[PDB]
Every structure is written in C-alpha cells, then in structure tokens.
Design a protein around this ligand. Structure first.
Ligand SMILES: O=S(=O)(O)OC[C@H]1O[C@H](O[C@H]2[C@@H](O)[C@@H](CO)O[C@@H](O)[C@@H]2OS(=O)(=O)O)[C@H](OS(=O)(=O)O)[C@@H](O)[C@H]1O[C@@H]1O[C@H](CO)[C@H](O)[C@H](O[C@H]2O[C@H](CO)[C@H](O)[C@H](O)[C@H]2O)[C@H]1OS(=O)(=O)O
Ligand SMILES: [Cl-]
Ligand SMILES: [Cl-]
Ligand SMILES: [Cl-]
Ligand SMILES: [Cl-]
Ligand SMILES: [Cl-]
Ligand SMILES: [Cl-]
Ligand SMILES: [Cl-]
Ligand SMILES: [Cl-]
Ligand SMILES: [Cl-]
Ligand SMILES: [Cl-]
Ligand SMILES: [Cl-]
Ligand SMILES: [Cl-]
Length: 581
C-alpha cells in the first residue's frame, strides 16, 4: 500500500535462507505502486550471491568491476527502508547497498555484516628475527598450500573446491598492522608493515609467518589488511537527499559509506564498530565523500576500529594529459581507484591548477566534453586557457562545495587519521571526541598521487576533545597540514584559509605538534585547554606544540590555558619551524 512488508514477498526471518529475491520483488513493487516505505519484521536476514543483481560500477577510492548488489536502489525516489533493528548478514562478495541516481532515500534501523571478514586477525603468540607465531580463531579460515604460502579462505567434490578456490581473491592481504590487545587500537607507534599478498608460512607440528620486517609484541593482535576494496557497505552515487539513521556497519570490503557526486547526505546515530570476535570494523574509511554538494551532516555517530580514516570530504583533480590546441585539452584520471569518475560536463567551471604548487592559475568555462575511456576525457573551453598551463598540471571542478557539519561524533581506535578536511565549503567541526593514532584532523589534498582536491576556505573547529591523539605516525601532529605542495612553492602557495580553532580540550601525552601548519592564511587558535597526560611514553623527537612554516596571519593567542606542564605557557605557545631545535 503505502508501506510494503518484505515478509509479504516471501522473505522469512531467522531461517538462514536467502532473502535476496524476495527483497528484489518487494523493491520492484515499491517502485511500481509508489510506496514510500519498506519494513522488515525484526529478525535476522541472510543474503547470498547466487540470485543478486549484477551491474558494472565505478566507485571512487574503491575498486571497480562487476558488483552483485543486494539492495540495488537505482532510480528510486521517496523511499524509506526501515529494518526495525534487524540484522543483515551478507555471504561472500556482495555490495549491500548501491544508491544510484536516487532521491530522498532514508535507511534506518538495521546492521550490516559479512559472515567471513575480508581481512583476518590472529593472536601473536611469539616473535623473533623475521617471524611471528600466530593463533587464528575459527572465523578466519586459512590454508597453507604446498608452496608454503598462507592463503585465507571463505571456508574450510571438485566443483565445491573450484568455487572455494575462486573465493581466495576476496581474502587476499597486502600489509599487516599490530593492534594492542587491551586497548583494541593500533599499537602505540606501530606502523603498517608491507608484505604483499603472499607470506611464507608453516604450521608448527599455531602458524609461523616469515618476513624480514615483521616485529610485534607477543600477546597483541595482528591484522592482515584486505588487499581489495570490492565490497563497500553503502554506495551513494549521483543521488540526492539521502539519510542514514541508526545504521550499524560491522564490516565492509572497503569503505563503510562512500558518496560520489551526490547532494545532501546525512548520517546520524549510526556506528561503524566490530562484530563479535573481531578487533577491526570496515577494511577502509568509515565514511568518504567525493565531489559532493549541499549539506553533508555527520551527527552523533560512533566510528571505531576501521582500517582507515573516519571521514574524508574532497574533490577530484584530473591531470592535463594532452594539450590539443589553445582551447582544448584531454584530461586523464590518475589514481586507479578514480577510473570511471565522469564529472566534467558542458557549462561547468573548472579550476586550472599548477600541479606542484596547488596554486590556481585561472578558472575557465567548458563548452563541450567527450568521455574517451574510463581514464581520458577531452575538454573544450570557451576561451583559450592560461598560456602557462603545461601537461602535468590539473583541473578540478568548481562546485557549490558541500557545507560540512560534523557534530557529536566519537572517533577512536582506527588506523590512520580522524578527519581529512578537504572541504572548501563552510565547515563546522564541533563537539566530537578524537582518539586516533594518526592526525585527528588533517588538511591534505594533492595533484601528484591521490589527485584529491582540498584547500579549505572556512573552517570552525570548536569544543572538541582530542585525547592522546596522534599517538603513532600517520600524520604530522594532532591538527596538521600535509598538502602536496613542493617546498619550493610553500612560501607563495596559500592553500588553506580562514580557520578558527577555539574552545577545545587537547589532552596530550608529549610535546608533538598540536598544530603543524604550512601554506595557511588566517588561523586563530584561542580559548583552548591543553592538558598534559602520561598515557603513552613521550617521544624525544618532538619538543614543540606549534610548528608553523610559510604561513601568514596565524594567531596562537595568549588566552589559551595549559595544565600540568613543567614550563610556562609563553615557552609552550611559542611557534617553531622544527619539531625540536
Ligand atoms: O606514510 S603513511 O602516512 O604511513 O601512509 C601509509 C601508507 O602505507 C602503505 O605504504 C607504506 C607502507 O607499506 C610501509 C611498509 O613498510 O612502507 C612505506 O614507506 C610506505 O609509505 S608510502 O606509501 O608513503 O610510499 C600503503 O601501501 S600498501 O598497502 O601497498 O602497503 C600506502 O598507500 C599508504 O597507505 C595510505 O596511508 C594513509 C595514512 O597515512 C591513508 O590511510 C591512505 O588511505 C586513505 O587516504 C588517502 C588520501 O591520503 C585516500 O583518501 C584513500 O582512499 C584513503 O583510504 C592509505 O592508502 S591505502 O590504504 O593503501 O589505500
Ligand atoms: Cl504489497
Ligand atoms: Cl516473518
Ligand atoms: Cl544499482
Ligand atoms: Cl523525490
Ligand atoms: Cl554466518
Ligand atoms: Cl574460474
Ligand atoms: Cl555483534
Ligand atoms: Cl585498503
Ligand atoms: Cl614546476
Ligand atoms: Cl567538497
Ligand atoms: Cl631525536
Ligand atoms: Cl593574542
């Protein structure tokens, strides 16, 4: 009627049977009749590959290919999916949700998990020169083949072997990271150890893995980082007015929520958090927004234990590959996880940017655009473009940049950074808790490897708590700039502008930078409380709370408060150019 009950289409809870086809039929009926809601009788629902719809997808900062989709929400309008706090379990290579060219879609009250994680975890039972001894629990099956290589499996007749073998790709790894057993966070100062996808291994007649760079503390947990990003949790693509309310994402092969080229997204009262027996949630970013517009609201969420940043809101740079004539260029997407990102349309305004400095030469209007491939697009401008532009420079679309509201979130226990603020729109970061091994807030962006467009223009960071963040090495300080500006251009490049950091509590354990800035104009750091702790060992390489280079109009104000420090506030609040002296 107005509300469609998925059990009227044969999806039965708690049985363990596949509910994919019944779900599909309920979705098509909702589109046929104009229903505004689908409800699940509260229970457990399982979804498998065999009857899932298949679609080519490019998904920014994730891996492209054929996706099997359990909720294929393409061209839906004005539809709410209320799971009534049901539990959704996905078996194998599924993308749970893709919202494609949809509008006013509300997702509420369910959880997402996969029956076997894409990553794997092990207890570290011993260590030595070039090896670790590991105990795996049952939920991470593996085989050690005749070659002496550790290969994780989907599960423990010739065609069943063949399909299991075909599953091996999904559980490939590329690096390992040590997690502290007691704190359930990346181990203090441990770093990613690259291994590649094949580790020599042997079972001691416990599994021993061999690699020259292995180093960890016994009793900690070793995480094998999933190599691939093929199965993100919720994809929001070319869509508008999407809300996620009380969604729990226990796991994904890649990001928890990834949005590209969409407009108005809210994520509220949701959580990314591990399920029973796991120390890791999603295998990449909890959330992530590419070329999005309107309001992006992250309200009152819990993001913990994912293998990457909690959020990143940014644009796409594309390199100028070939100059065809004075008015025409071919641009090329650079990073493999950007291939297929079409964004340049007739009448768009583009920034033309010098690659090594991130200085904008000019803006220009595009009159025509032709997609040549999933890499190359040809672009014709209305007037001849600036004569200084060379091949190797980049373009970025001048958007109505997203207004970013990030309020009331708890961000902790994840690998890497807290928030990558590459939002050039009006940005508000207020009343969040950060406990991250990397930079809690990082202004990044580059046009040489990730080709992500950042460059802040209006940022307010007010009344957050930064507790012993940046306790490892993914970043350059608690709040830091690592934008891709060559040293030669730092003094003249001003990439991030107009930043107010007021009313925060920084609980710090050593004298690593609270602020580490370059190429900034107009930043005010006032009315903050800085308070010394002993939560982690002090690192002797840091002796400066405020490292500032190649910036202007930076006020580190006198009205900040310092508690528990040996030295006086006038030494401690005084900027250096270096970490030490
Ligand atoms: O230098 S770090 O800040 O620590 O970056 C970490 C880095 O890890 C791997 O590369 C390093 C290690 O492999 C290490 C092992 O001994 O050797 C180092 O010298 C390598 O450093 S290097 O890459 O700077 O040359 C990653 O490669 S690997 O998995 O094949 O081993 C490498 O890509 C890089 O990982 C990135 O670290 C970031 C935090 O520092 C962040 O998590 C990146 O992902 C997210 O951020 C970027 C924007 O910066 C994009 O938005 C991504 O989509 C986000 O997911 C992370 O990249 S990724 O996980 O490989 O995709
Ligand atoms: Cl009906
Ligand atoms: Cl039922
Ligand atoms: Cl779809
Ligand atoms: Cl609508
Ligand atoms: Cl299961
Ligand atoms: Cl095959
Ligand atoms: Cl659980
Ligand atoms: Cl990854
Ligand atoms: Cl140059
Ligand atoms: Cl943006
Ligand atoms: Cl030192
Ligand atoms: Cl002052």
């Amino acid at each position: 009627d107005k509300v469609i009950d998925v059990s009227d289409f044969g999806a039965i809870k708690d049985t363990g049977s596949d509910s994919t086809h019944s779900l599909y039929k309920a979705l098509q009926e909702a589109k046929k009749i104009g229903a505004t809601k689908i409800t699940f009788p509260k229970g457990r629902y399982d979804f498998y590959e065999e009857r899932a719809a298949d679609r080519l997808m490019y998904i920014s900062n994730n891996d492209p290919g054929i996706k099997r989709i359990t909720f294929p929400l393409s061209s839906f309008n004005n539809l709410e999916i209320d799971g009534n706090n049901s539990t959704f379990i996905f078996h194998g290579g599924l993308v749970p949700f893709i919202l494609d060219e949809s509008s006013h879609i509300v997702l509420r009250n369910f959880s997402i998990d996969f029956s076997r994680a894409f990553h794997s975890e092990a207890l570290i039972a011993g260590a030595g020169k070039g090896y670790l001894d590991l105990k795996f629990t049952d939920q991470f099956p593996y085989k050690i083949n005749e070659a002496g290589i550790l290969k994780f499996q989907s599960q423990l007749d010739r065609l069943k072997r063949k399909q299991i073998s075909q599953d091996e790709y999904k559980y490939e790894y590329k690096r390992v990271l040590e997690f502290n057993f007691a704190l359930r966070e990346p181990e203090y100062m441990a770093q990613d150890i690259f291994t590649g996808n094949a580790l020599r291994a042997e079972k001691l007649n416990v599994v021993r893995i061999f690699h020259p760079n292995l180093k960890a503390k016994v009793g900690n947990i070793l995480v094998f980082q999933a190599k691939h990003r093929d199965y993100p949790g919720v994809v929001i693509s070319d869509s508008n007015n999407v809300e996620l309310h009380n969604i729990t994402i226990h796991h994904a092969g890649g990001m928890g929520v990834i949005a590209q080229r969409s407009h108005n997204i809210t994520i509220k009262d949701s959580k990314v958090s591990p399920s029973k027996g796991r120390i890791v949630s999603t295998t990449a970013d909890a959330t992530h927004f590419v070329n999005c517009t309107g309001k992006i609201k992250l309200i009152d969420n819990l993001f913990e234990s994912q293998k990457n940043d909690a959020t990143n809101i940014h644009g796409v740079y594309a390199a100028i590959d070939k100059i065809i004539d004075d008015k025409t260029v071919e641009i090329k997407l650079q990073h493999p996880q950007q291939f297929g990102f079409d964004f340049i349309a007739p009448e768009d305004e583009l920034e033309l940017v010098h690659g090594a400095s991130l200085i904008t030469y000019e803006t220009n209007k595009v009159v025509t655009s032709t997609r040549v491939s999933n890499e190359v697009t040809r672009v014709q401008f209305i007037k001849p473009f600036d004569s200084r532009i060379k091949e190797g420079d980049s373009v970025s679309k001048v958007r109505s940049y997203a207004e970013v509201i990030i309020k009331g979130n708890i961000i902790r226990k994840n690998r890497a950074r807290g928030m990558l603020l590459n939002s050039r729109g009006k940005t508000l970061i207020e009343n969040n808790y950060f406990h991250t091994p990397g930079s809690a807030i990082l202004f990044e962006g580059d046009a040489n490897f990730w080709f992500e467009q950042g460059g802040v223009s209006d940022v307010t960071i007010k009344n957050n708590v930064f507790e012993n963040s940046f306790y490892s090495q993914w970043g350059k300080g608690i709040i830091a700039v690592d934008a891709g500006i060559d040293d030669k251009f730092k003094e003249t490049s001003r990439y991030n502008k107009n930043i107010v950091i007021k009313g925060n509590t920084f609980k710090v354990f050593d004298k690593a930078p609270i602020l580490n800035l370059f190429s900034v104009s107009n930043l005010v750091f006032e009315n903050n409380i800085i308070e010394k702790t002993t939560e982690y060992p002090e690192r002797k390489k840091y002796n400066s709370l405020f490292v500032i280079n190649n910036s202007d109009n930076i006020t580190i104000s006198i009205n900040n408060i310092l508690q528990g420090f040996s030295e006086g506030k006038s030494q401690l609040l005084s900027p250096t150019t270096t970490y030490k002296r």
